[PDB]
Design an enzyme around this catalytic site. Structure first.
Site, mmCIF file in Angstrom:
data_model
loop_
_atom_site.group_PDB
_atom_site.id
_atom_site.type_symbol
_atom_site.label_atom_id
_atom_site.label_comp_id
_atom_site.label_asym_id
_atom_site.label_seq_id
_atom_site.Cartn_x
_atom_site.Cartn_y
_atom_site.Cartn_z
ATOM 1 N N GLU A 169 25.377 44.619 47.341
ATOM 2 C CA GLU A 169 25.203 45.873 47.778
ATOM 3 C C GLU A 169 23.841 46.347 48.244
ATOM 4 O OE1 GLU A 169 29.448 46.812 45.164
ATOM 5 O OE2 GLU A 169 27.403 47.989 44.921
ATOM 6 N N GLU A 310 34.008 42.111 46.277
ATOM 7 C CA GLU A 310 34.578 43.091 45.225
ATOM 8 C C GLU A 310 35.437 44.052 45.523
ATOM 9 O OE1 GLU A 310 31.416 45.401 43.080
ATOM 10 O OE2 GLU A 310 29.866 43.490 43.108
HETATM 11 ZN ZN LIG Z 1 29.849 46.981 42.856
#
Ligand SMILES: [Zn+2]
Ligand SMILES: [Zn+2]
Ligand SMILES: [Zn+2]
Ligand SMILES: [Zn+2]
Ligand SMILES: [Zn+2]
Ligand SMILES: [Zn+2]
Ligand SMILES: [Zn+2]
Ligand SMILES: [Zn+2]
Length: 378
Positions: A169, A310
């Site tokens: 991320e 994810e």
């Molecule tokens: Zn995450």
């Protein structure tokens, strides 16, 4: 095909291949994956080893049809000597006296005996927060890369480790337009080495491929990319962390086509109340086109391997009721478009906005959530 294990992974088109270099056998593989987190936390071990035995967990994951685990870690967990916290050594007597690296090695060797692929994910530099960039004022890019190099040399020896999810991320911590140039957040295609994740992924990936040439390199999206790109799409400012791959078309990561995998994250109403989750914005029939623009076109138009790293949510359990609709819609869409390789967040129940596949008893599964997910596994 150079490899220290006999096994070499590579991308052909939008498909991942496992190649046995001595015998010449080669197959496409699916990744039907789950995240099992904890090695990126101050406990320095996958969570759930108070209530469960680590090998029973791998067996259960397998029995549910998954064949892959994404394994988040933080810097301290992959240095020798770091002690794990929270294990019940009565349920896990073979873990007594091991450090977190020894436990990681034991788990990955066992997954491999069970035919489970492992994807390693450098999820945090510290063990407390996901940083926006791939360095910090006290931990440089050079340090980040040297850590991946020592991870790649150690874990590259396990046949079932498919490679490296470079940095979890990349994202921003201020709004555009300042986020594009204020140096606090990841960008993509700004032409600025301090913040451009596309260029960092090139540098970090090349360094890992030198020592693990047989690995895949998984590159996530950023949150914001560059003003041009983000402003060109109506929901261009509303992509998730690691979920904006809009800048791939104009600024492809320059890593070998047979090594590079793109890996967006994508979430539902339980994680953030996005404007586009209003039925009065089109929900859920508007979703497909949003997913398509944020990342899907990277496979559907450009032809790349795109593995969602994810996605997840409470699926109606003490969460937003729209989540049930959102995961049903997202799985229909992945089936219809042949996004068949993925990692669900998460195996663990102890994730505050998403829950997991297991319930809070760390033993029973959410049947309905799992049954929806299982449609992906054919
Ligand atoms: Zn995450
Ligand atoms: Zn597949
Ligand atoms: Zn299949
Ligand atoms: Zn620690
Ligand atoms: Zn510490
Ligand atoms: Zn921090
Ligand atoms: Zn469209
Ligand atoms: Zn339910």
């Amino acid at each position: 095909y150079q490899t220290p294990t006999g096994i070499y992974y590579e991308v052909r088109g939008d498909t991942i291949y496992m190649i046995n270099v001595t015998s010449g056998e080669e197959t496409p593989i699916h990744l039907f994956g789950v995240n099992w987190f904890g090695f990126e936390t101050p406990n320095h071990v996958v969570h759930g080893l108070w209530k469960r035995n680590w090998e029973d967990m791998l067996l259960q994951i397998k029995s549910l049809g998954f064949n892959a685990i994404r394994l988040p870690f933080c810097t301290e967990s992959v240095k020798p000597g770091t002690q794990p916290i929270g294990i019940d050594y009565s349920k896990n007597p073979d873990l007594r006296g091991l450090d977190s690296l020894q436990i990681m090695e034991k788990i990955i060797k066992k997954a491999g005996d069970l035919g489970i692929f492992v994807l390693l994910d450098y999820h945090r530099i510290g063990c407390t927060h996901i940083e926006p960039l791939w360095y910090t004022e006290d931990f440089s890019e050079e340090d980040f890369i040297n850590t991946w190099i020592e991870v790649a040399k150690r874990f590259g020896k396990y046949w079932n480790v498919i490679g490296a999810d470079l940095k979890n991320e990349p994202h921003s911590v201020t709004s555009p337009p300042a986020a594009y140039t204020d140096g606090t957040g990841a960008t993509w295609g700004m032409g600025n080495p301090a913040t451009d994740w596309n260029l960092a992924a090139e540098r970090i990936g090349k360094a890992i491929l030198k020592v693990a040439p047989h690995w895949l390199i998984f590159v996530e999206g950023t949150q914001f990319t560059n003003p041009k790109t983000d402003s060109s799409y109506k929901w261009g400012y509303n992509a998730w962390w690691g979920g904006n791959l809009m800048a791939v078309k104009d600024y492809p990561v320059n890593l070998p086509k047979n090594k590079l995998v793109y890996s967006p994250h994508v979430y539902g109403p339980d994680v953030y109340n996005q404007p586009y989750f209003g039925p009065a914005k089109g929900f859920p029939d508007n979703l497909p086109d949003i997913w398509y623009h944020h990342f899907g076109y990277v496979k559907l138009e450009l032809g790349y391997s795109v593995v969602i790293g994810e996605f997840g949510g409470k699926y109606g359990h003490g969460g937003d009721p729209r989540d049930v609709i959102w995961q049903n819609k997202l799985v229909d869409w992945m089936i219809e478009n042949k996004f068949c390789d993925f990692f669900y967040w998460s195996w663990n129940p102890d994730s505050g906005d998403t829950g997991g596949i297991l319930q809070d008893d760390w033993t029973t599964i959410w049947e309905d959530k799992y049954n929806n997910l299982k449609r992906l596994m054919d």
